[PDB]
């Protein structure tokens, strides 16, 4: 809010992928989304603490 930017939320457990790893490519896929919008904050979810 006060930082004049955006907020990006990333699912931690959904990042883990079996078979051919999608999360390995999801690193650079979200990097493209991070490249499109410079004023943003990427957050790591599902590894955080809601309780």
């Amino acid at each position: 809010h006060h930082t004049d930017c955006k907020f990006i939320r990333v699912s931690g457990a959904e990042l883990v992928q079996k078979y051919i790893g999608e999360g390995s490519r999801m690193v650079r896929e979200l990097f493209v989304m991070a490249r499109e919008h410079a004023p943003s904050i990427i957050f790591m979810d599902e590894i955080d603490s809601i309780g």
Binding site: S11, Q17, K18, Y19, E22, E46
Partner: protein, 86 residues
């Protein structure tokens, strides 16, 4: 879900949603995609929800620990009813 907007006193109950729990890819379109296009439409048909507020959707399941945590976001699934024995 179209009939939920037309007839107000309607209750739609989907039993055993635990059939899908976490995720699968494998063959991609083959024998998988069927429920992944539903998740996008679970974010779509439930967007038209809240207009009438007469729609009733109740999902039954066994193991709720492996289900989709993103559904707990308000606007789709608000409060879950625990069924212990005790």
């Amino acid at each position: 879900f179209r009939l939920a907007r037309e007839n107000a006193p309607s209750i739609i109950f989907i039993d055993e949603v635990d059939s899908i729990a976490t995720k699968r890819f494998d063959a991609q379109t083959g024998s998988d995609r069927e429920v992944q296009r539903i998740l996008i439409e679970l974010l779509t048909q439930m967007d038209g929800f809240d207009q009438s507020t007469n729609v009733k959707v109740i999902m039954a399941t066994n193991r709720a620990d492996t289900l989709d945590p993103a559904l707990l976001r308000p606007g789709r699934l608000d409060r879950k009813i625990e069924f212990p024995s005790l």
